[PDB]
Amino acid sequence: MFTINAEVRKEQGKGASRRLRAANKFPAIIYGGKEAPLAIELDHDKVMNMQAKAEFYSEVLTIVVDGKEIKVKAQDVQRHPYKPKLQHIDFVRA
């Protein structure tokens, strides 16, 4: 039921990722095996508060991108070593 809007990324690389993370946004990825992987960026604090709920990895999420609704499932997450911040999450279409 958790629904997050998100804007497609335009720049990839360490520099672009760090520039995003310095503006309270972190990148992420949508893939589904038989579908073209999609780069995405999504707001940091909204999903960080979504994180506390144990249902985040349990239920099916709804990602909104340029007016498109897709249903996905959180695959994995990598976090900052010491601060409670996220660099990047992995999403599987489902």
Partner 1 sequence: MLQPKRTKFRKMHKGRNRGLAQGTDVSFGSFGLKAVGRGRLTARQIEAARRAMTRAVKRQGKIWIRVFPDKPITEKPLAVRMGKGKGNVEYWVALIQPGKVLYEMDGVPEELAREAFKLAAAKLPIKTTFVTKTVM
4 binds partner 1 (CB under 8 A): no
By CB under 7 A, the residues from 1 to 40 that bind RNA are none
83 binds RNA (CB under 7 A): yes
Give CA–CA dist 78/68, Å, rounded.
Answer: 26
* Cβ 13 vs Cβ 21: under 8 Å: no
Q: What is the closest distance, in whole angstroms, from the C-beta atom of residue 46 to partner 1 in the complex?
A: 18
Look at residue 59 and give its three-state secondary structure: coil
Say which entry of partner 1, RNA, none residue 59 contacts (CB below 5 to 8 A, set by partner kind): none
